Amino acid sequence: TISKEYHIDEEVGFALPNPQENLPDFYNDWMFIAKHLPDLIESGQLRERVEKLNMLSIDHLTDHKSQRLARLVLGCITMAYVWGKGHGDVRKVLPRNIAVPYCQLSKKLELPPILVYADCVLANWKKKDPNKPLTYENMDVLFSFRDGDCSKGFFLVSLLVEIAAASAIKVIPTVFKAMQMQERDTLLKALLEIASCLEKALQVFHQIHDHVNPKAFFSVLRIYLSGWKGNPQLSDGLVYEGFWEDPKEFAGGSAGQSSVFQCFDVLLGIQQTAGGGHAAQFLQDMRRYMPPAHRNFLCSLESNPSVREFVLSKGDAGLREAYDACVKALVSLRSYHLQIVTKYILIPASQGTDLMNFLKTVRSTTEKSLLK
Amino acid sequence: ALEVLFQGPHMWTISKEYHIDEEVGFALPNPQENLPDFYNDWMFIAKHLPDLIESGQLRERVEKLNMLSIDHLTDHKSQRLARLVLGCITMAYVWGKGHGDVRKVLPRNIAVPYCQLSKKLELPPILVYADCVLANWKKKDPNKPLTYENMDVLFSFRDGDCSKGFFLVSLLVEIAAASAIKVIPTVFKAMQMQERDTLLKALLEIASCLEKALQVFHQIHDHVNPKAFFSVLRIYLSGWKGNPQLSDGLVYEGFWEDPKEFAGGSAGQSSVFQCFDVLLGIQQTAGGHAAQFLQDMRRYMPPAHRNFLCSLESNPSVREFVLSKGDAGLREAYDACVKALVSLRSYHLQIVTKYILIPASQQPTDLMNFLKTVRSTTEKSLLKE
Ligand code: HEM
Ligand code: HEM
Ligand SMILES: O[C@@H](c1cn(-c2ccc3[nH]ccc3c2)nn1)c1c(C2CC2)sc2cncn12
Ligand SMILES: O[C@@H](c1cn(-c2ccc3[nH]ccc3c2)nn1)c1c(C2CC2)sc2cncn12
């Protein structure tokens, strides 16, 4: 089994298991702002409340779960401060009373000082009833940006698909041990088990229609997910007052920072990060925005022999069929995702085109990996 | 690799799966000089680039080739030689005499097998540091040692291009630095086991290897001349990523639809220098252009060597360990490694002034800033000035 040092959970996988809901009393001033973003943004009192804060030390965040909650809290406040109401007026400087401890905590956790997928998706959740299962009805997010932003639906549906895909992670050690031991039948059962997990993850995906609406996603949520890397609104980046002299550019929160999807492309030999193209460059850059243990996990998978090369080298139709079942399940997920992105991004934009090409290039690379 | 999946990142030994040699390190040990007779048509062109470019017959000889299958390259060394052969021909075809006329399309009879072999080896279809430096060499006498006098390159671009000097001197510095690679497992085991004296001897041994590598560097003056390097060799090292001569990249006829952009051969693709920055916690790859360039150049390294660098990043921080000890001796040994890197990079800046900066001014920079930023990042990693 996968070492504890990789921080992969048996149940939720790359998601943070049982995230912390509240910070120690020393940080109640941060917690008040973060828990009241919809009202403080709408009223215009948010930027003032941030500017009125006293610079706190990160020294009172003892455990990893408190450090991860503080990252989500500070990250949500930073996005809200920079974008405000999201109708034009951008703040180009992050005050030192928040930027200093944000960059300090970010340096400790080896993550950039910007809200990432690991903050608003992997750590932004809770069970309503701990005795009930991990289903949409029994879950909620810790923070939202605005009322009606569909943040709960967007984040929880991504999280539920992450957990659905995570069921195949435990099969990875079996795949590599079966190749080493030359256990052909074991590798076939293992590849077929991974395919069924990825097929089950596509069924989970269907919930996106019931908890997100195109208008709220396109006109509201999108604003707060935006970063400052190649953005004309902050052409040189953001100033992290009292930490850096020059403004630093960081990419916004992306599902391209999800370790589960990157790990199945690595596992199946789908060279998503190879080729020198924009899609490959983006996905490689997004690894720097993943928790360090999860970034280490992906590299360890790349250090292991190629499952695709092994299957190609065997002249075994059954083994090729099992390998192709995994690849087909990934093409199916990415093809369904493209239809969702057409409904939620492409069509609302007409009532953008680059995101379609990025997803189509990623999907095409997966399709071209089929042995047949 | 399976053990690291079950017990976590731990580099107690350098596995053979990383393709690092005990003697030449990241360089390809004993590279193949000749391809099977099936590829003599490629070999003729590659071995005669100076004469074929100068005569004007080169582009014609490439266009006259029949598309050969990569199926007759069985071993890894033949595949690496074919990459160097095809890569050298591609650079010569694209640039020609290098005085204006560029070819924006690579013919399919060469581009198809080049991209096929490149896809197998997980490297881009452009000449990389691993081709013209790590695989472009041979021992004149196998019984004599790895010294400049007993070595030669397999391919050159033009007569008097100083390719032998530029490539072999880079290679000899690579091998000099490689002697410290075997000390890496000792460093990680000493930190795990809390063996303070062992870690001190290990850090001092790495420093002496990096100090010996600066002495090796001095040979650059005797085998390279500024005029030949600036007016000739530079042309053939140029790539097609952000180049105004091939603004959209190169067309790899019969392999890709759109023209693909790839960066030219760079010493920023050297795994030995990147691995000592990773080992010493010099965050060379951590938002600026210099950091982005060095991270991108990892995609141009052999896959096993790219995996080696990420495995080093997965292991605990030697810098954090040394900082946390309040031990002047351990800090002095750590600083000896960092100082040896600052010394190398400072001597290199003087070489780049002599070979690039001054020749550029004697005619009717961004690379200076890149090197200065890399050197500054190394200097700022010193615990005590
Ligand atoms: C409202 C529905 C959704 C929309 C509009 C949407 C949109 C997008 C966009 C625009 C990208 C491109 C990267 C970027 O610009 O950040 C992307 C990438 C991606 N999305 Fe979604 N997404 C949706 C739902 C989901 C869900 C539920 C998941 C499940 C985890 C998911 C997983 C991914 C993955 C893994 C990528 C990276 C590329 C790939 O591996 O195919 N998406 N998505
Ligand atoms: C004729 C002498 C030399 C010149 C003019 C020269 C020039 C350059 C240039 C222009 C770069 C910037 C990157 C690029 O544009 O691709 C560079 C980087 C570099 N060069 Fe050289 N070089 C010389 C000799 C050497 C030798 C002998 C080595 C030994 C291995 C070496 C090692 C490096 C390294 C490691 C880098 C990456 C940046 C760094 O880590 O400091 N150079 N060089
Ligand atoms: O990649 C993120 C994203 C950016 N945009 C976006 C970016 C640019 C845009 N332009 C016009 C619409 C639009 C939407 N949507 N989603 C994302 C998530 C974030 C929590 C981190 S969760 C998820 C699942 N599939 C994608 N994502
Ligand atoms: O990075 C490569 C390079 C580019 N240029 C260059 C780049 C821009 C220029 N502008 C005017 C002259 C000129 C030369 N020199 N060297 C390089 C090597 C390549 C074989 C792989 S070997 C080596 C050691 N130090 C650097 N290098």
From Swiss-Prot, chain A:
Transmembrane segments: none
InterPro entries on file: Indolamine_dOase (IPR000898), Trp/Indoleamine_2_3_dOase-like (IPR037217)
GO cellular component term of the entry, any: stereocilium bundle
Positions of heme b binding: 337
Keywords: Cytoplasm, Dioxygenase, Heme, Immunity, Iron, Metal-binding, Oxidoreductase, Tryptophan catabolism
Enzyme class label: oxidoreductase
Pfam families registered for this protein in UniProt: IDO
Note in the entry: IDO1 is the target for therapy in a range of clinical settings, including cancer, chronic infections, autoimmune and allergic syndromes, and transplantation.
Subunit structure: Monomer.
Protein name: Indoleamine 2,3-dioxygenase 1
Lineage: Eukaryota, Metazoa, Chordata, Craniata, Vertebrata
